[PDB]
Design a protein around this motif. Structure first.
Motif, PDB file in Angstrom:
ATOM      1  N   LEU A   1      42.447  32.032  40.250  1.00  0.00           N
ATOM      2  CA  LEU A   1      42.919  33.212  40.460  1.00  0.00           C
ATOM      3  C   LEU A   1      43.234  33.294  41.941  1.00  0.00           C
ATOM      4  CD1 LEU A   1      43.387  35.963  38.814  1.00  0.00           C
ATOM      5  CD2 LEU A   1      41.250  36.707  40.101  1.00  0.00           C
ATOM      6  N   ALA A   2      42.900  32.566  42.821  1.00  0.00           N
ATOM      7  CA  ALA A   2      43.263  32.691  44.155  1.00  0.00           C
ATOM      8  C   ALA A   2      44.732  31.729  44.389  1.00  0.00           C
ATOM      9  CB  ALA A   2      42.252  32.132  45.257  1.00  0.00           C
TER      10      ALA A   2
ATOM     11  N   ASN B   1      51.969  34.202  43.770  1.00  0.00           N
ATOM     12  CA  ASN B   1      52.873  35.680  43.659  1.00  0.00           C
ATOM     13  C   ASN B   1      53.066  35.985  44.946  1.00  0.00           C
ATOM     14  OD1 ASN B   1      53.249  37.416  40.937  1.00  0.00           O
ATOM     15  ND2 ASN B   1      52.675  38.441  42.941  1.00  0.00           N
ATOM     16  N   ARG B   2      52.172  35.806  45.972  1.00  0.00           N
ATOM     17  CA  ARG B   2      52.423  36.580  47.251  1.00  0.00           C
ATOM     18  C   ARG B   2      53.460  35.874  47.943  1.00  0.00           C
ATOM     19  NH1 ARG B   2      47.687  37.792  47.952  1.00  0.00           N
ATOM     20  NH2 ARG B   2      47.014  35.644  48.657  1.00  0.00           N
TER      21      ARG B   2
ATOM     22  N   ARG C   1      32.260  30.711  37.532  1.00  0.00           N
ATOM     23  CA  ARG C   1      32.895  31.893  37.882  1.00  0.00           C
ATOM     24  C   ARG C   1      33.510  31.458  39.193  1.00  0.00           C
ATOM     25  NH1 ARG C   1      31.041  36.498  35.341  1.00  0.00           N
ATOM     26  NH2 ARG C   1      29.148  35.983  34.132  1.00  0.00           N
TER      27      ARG C   1
ATOM     28  N   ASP D   1      46.906  31.590  41.970  1.00  0.00           N
ATOM     29  CA  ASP D   1      47.751  32.096  41.298  1.00  0.00           C
ATOM     30  C   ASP D   1      48.353  33.384  42.160  1.00  0.00           C
ATOM     31  OD1 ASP D   1      47.145  30.211  39.545  1.00  0.00           O
ATOM     32  OD2 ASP D   1      46.666  31.774  37.838  1.00  0.00           O
ATOM     33  N   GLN D   2      47.539  33.957  42.813  1.00  0.00           N
ATOM     34  CA  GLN D   2      47.868  35.036  43.651  1.00  0.00           C
ATOM     35  C   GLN D   2      48.654  34.710  44.878  1.00  0.00           C
ATOM     36  OE1 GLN D   2      44.325  37.842  44.098  1.00  0.00           O
ATOM     37  NE2 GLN D   2      44.896  38.836  42.215  1.00  0.00           N
TER      38      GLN D   2
ATOM     39  N   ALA E   1      37.473  31.710  40.025  1.00  0.00           N
ATOM     40  CA  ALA E   1      38.082  32.622  41.130  1.00  0.00           C
ATOM     41  C   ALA E   1      38.942  31.618  41.724  1.00  0.00           C
ATOM     42  CB  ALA E   1      36.940  32.911  42.120  1.00  0.00           C
TER      43      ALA E   1
END
Lengths: 142, 53, 53, 24, 156
Positions: free
Chosen positions: C35-36, C42-43, C28, C38-39, C32
């Motif tokens: 995902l952090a 994107n940001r 998990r 990748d985000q 996470a």
């Protein structure tokens, strides 16, 4: 059972620092006693340590080692002209002359012999072993 | 030592952090009866539990 | 060009509990972390960063 | 004061539900 | 028909969470005494055992010196009142050095490097009556209706 502690032995495994690039300039240093830096060579990088004297700022506490120093007495001792381990940050057992445990978190004061008389702070350990009366001290590096 | 004068058993897994054990008791009675009897006494059981960490 | 990074912690007791209960806790945290990252990419694309020009 | 406890008559669903965070 | 795609961001932190992997120190030889401790709130020391070695801690109180802040753990914490708490009579993970996310009840963002002030219940507050050696590290965020603050703890 077992004995609880010995002088000069590290208390816990928290953040600690040991300076192994030192040498005893004069006299003998007792394991578990505070030391001071008499002279720090600028280029060679060695520090000349000595037993604490009157009106001086302590540096660290000498620790035990079964290989660096041997001696025929019951208690370990650092001989003149030998490399010495000095711990500058962490929790260590120390020689003391007091008879009652002080308050936790109090600021401790050091005698002229390098002992603990009535800035480093008390950690909470106060035991007795062969009439030595060890005290647990927290050392910071300033 | 406590490990030599008291019994030692191996029944609990290394991952458990709490355990529970139970004891049971019985209740009932019996009576002298004759043939053609309908009212017969009944029996039952019950239990209680305790915990540990 | 810029570099990105993060980290996570986990203890031995949590590892054993995950192995026993059937739900590990390390995967998990790995998800996470991914995902952090990748985000964050994107940001950076859609919002920029004033200090980094 | 019985013979069985609640935990002995319980079942946990095999499937779990996860919250969604779309990347973009 | 026009295809659509969506986007959503996670939260930054949780109460009592360790902020980053900088030099830290955790004191795990502690026991909770007389009450329950909320994760992300400061604790005090009531007695340090001279021989056994354990330290007895409880929630912060008026006119007392804080020692550290409890941190999250998925094995040592009990789930009560729809959150993580440290129950009475159990071991507690107490941090005494490093950066940590801590519960707050103020309304304005703090300034970097200024001293930290605590409330009677052990939560950060800009005008608290308890003085601490700690400083502010700059993080200031909000979980769902919960305020959080980043705090730097120095060894006592």
């Amino acid at each position: 059972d077992m004995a609880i502690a010995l002088p000069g032995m590290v208390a816990d495994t928290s953040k600690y620092n040991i300076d192994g690039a030192c040498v005893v300039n004069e006299g003998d240093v007792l394991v578990g006693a505070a030391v001071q830096v008499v002279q720090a060579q600028a280029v060679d990088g060695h520090k000349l340590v000595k037993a604490l004297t009157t009106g001086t700022t302590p540096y660290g506490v000498a620790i035990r080692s079964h290989w660096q120093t041997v001696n025929a007495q019951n208690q370990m001792i650092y001989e003149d002209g030998g490399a010495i381990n000095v711990m500058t940050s962490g929790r260590v057992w120390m020689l003391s002359k007091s008879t009652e445990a002080p308050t936790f978190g109090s600021a401790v004061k050091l005698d002229v012999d390098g002992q603990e008389k009535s800035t480093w702070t008390y950690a909470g350990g106060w035991t007795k072993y062969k009439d030595i009366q060890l005290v647990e001290v927290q050392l910071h590096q300033l | 030592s406590a490990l030599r004068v008291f019994p030692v058993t191996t029944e609990l897994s290394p991952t458990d952090k709490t355990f529970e054990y139970m004891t049971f008791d019985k209740v009932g009675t019996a009576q002298i009866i004759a043939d053609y009897t309908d009212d017969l006494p009944l029996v039952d059981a019950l239990g209680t539990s305790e915990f540990g960490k | 060009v810029f570099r990105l990074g993060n980290a996570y912690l986990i203890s031995i007791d949590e590892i054993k509990a995950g192995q026993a209960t059937g739900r590990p806790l390390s995967t998990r945290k790995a998800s996470a972390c991914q995902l952090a990252h990748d985000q964050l990419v994107n940001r950076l694309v859609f919002k920029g960063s004033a200090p980094h020009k | 004061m019985g013979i069985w406890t609640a935990q002995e008559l319980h079942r946990i669903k095999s499937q779990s539900y996860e919250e969604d965070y779309p990347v973009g």
